[PDB]
Amino acid sequence: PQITLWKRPLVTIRIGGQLKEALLDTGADDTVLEEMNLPGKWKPKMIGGIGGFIKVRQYDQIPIEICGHKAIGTVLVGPTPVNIIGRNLLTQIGCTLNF
Amino acid sequence: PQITLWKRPLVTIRIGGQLKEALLDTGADDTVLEEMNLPGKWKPKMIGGIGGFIKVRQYDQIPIEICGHKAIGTVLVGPTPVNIIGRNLLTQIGCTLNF
Ligand SMILES: COc1ccc(S(=O)(=O)N(CC2CCCCC2)C[C@@H](O)[C@H](Cc2ccccc2)NC(=O)c2cccc(O)c2)cc1
Known part of the structure; x- marks a missing residue:
């Protein structure tokens, strides 16, 4: 879509069969989610x-469906x-800025 | 353009006699610029x-040129x-997210 x-x-994402709302943030290098449980090894x-x-936990190769697009x-x-x-992940779903 | x-x-912005590089940031409600001594009234x-x-000074009705678009x-x-x-300011230059 065009937004x-x-x-x-804000869009709905699907991660681990859970729906969450997340902000599309072109000023963020990284994808950062509030406190939650994810499976696998993490690195501090x-x-x-x-x-x-801030301190965060890094999980690699995690699938997220962002507004119907897979990452x-x-x-x-x-x-x-x-x-x-x-x-x-914005790059993975083919998201660009346009004006 | 498409970015x-x-x-x-990062794009070139102009505020008075200062050209600066700034992030087009869909995650930012408001425009935040590095420290500079702008004229006129402000509110903390x-x-x-x-x-x-962080603590900022809010200045209203400041013209900015963003990639040669007026805001x-x-x-x-x-x-x-x-x-x-x-x-x-992104809405003023006609900026959308597309995927
Ligand atoms: C009300 O107006 C606001 C309020 C907040 C902000 S914000 O900057 O905090 N911010 C607002 C966000 C913050 C997170 C939750 C939603 C609200 C804009 C955001 O895009 C910032 C931009 C950024 C980039 C580099 C260094 C500092 C900041 N990115 C990041 O914080 C960021 C940058 C690189 C890597 C990373 O993991 C995160 C901007 C404008």
């Missing part, structure tokens, strides 16, 4: 945002204010 | 993201690591 920006670009990681650095990639889990879909 | 997301969506504000909150609106000025063009 305008007068409202937050640190990432930086506007307010400083399989790195998902970070941690204390993000909102679930965000970043560039690593 | 892919393989790399950070706190904004939050990954890592917590005018609210700009938040403070100790951000990166210049951020938020949805308030």
Whole structure:
């Protein structure tokens, strides 16, 4: 679809048979989800945002269906204010900015 | 134009006699610029993201040129690591997400 920006670009994603709302975030390098349980080995990681650095858990090769489009990639889990879909997966679903 | 997301969506913006590189950021409600001594009235504000909150100065009705598109609106000025063009100005240059 085409998504305008007068409202937050929130979409439904499917991860582990759970539906969640996530924000399409072109300013985010990474995909970062609020506290949740995911299967597999994780590696501790640190990432930086506007307010400083946080600790997150890195899960690789995780499938997510973003608004009907399939991705399989790195998902970070941690204390993000909102679930965000970043560039690593935006590229997988063929998302571009247009004006 | 169409901007892919393989790399950070950085573009040239103009605010007075300052050209700067800024992120076209669909995850940002508002525009946040690195510290600069803009003229006129402002109000203090706190904004939050990954890592917590920072203190900014909100300036209203500031003209910005973004990739040669004209915009005018609210700009938040403070100790951000990166210049951020938020949805308030993205809608004004006609910016959409497409996939
Ligand atoms: C109200 O206006 C706002 C409020 C918040 C923000 S925000 O910047 O915090 N922010 C708002 C978001 C924050 C997360 C939850 C939803 C709200 C915009 C976001 O795109 C930032 C941009 C960014 C990039 C690099 C360094 C610092 C910031 N990305 C990131 O925080 C980010 C960058 C690179 C890697 C990464 O893992 C995350 C912007 C405008």
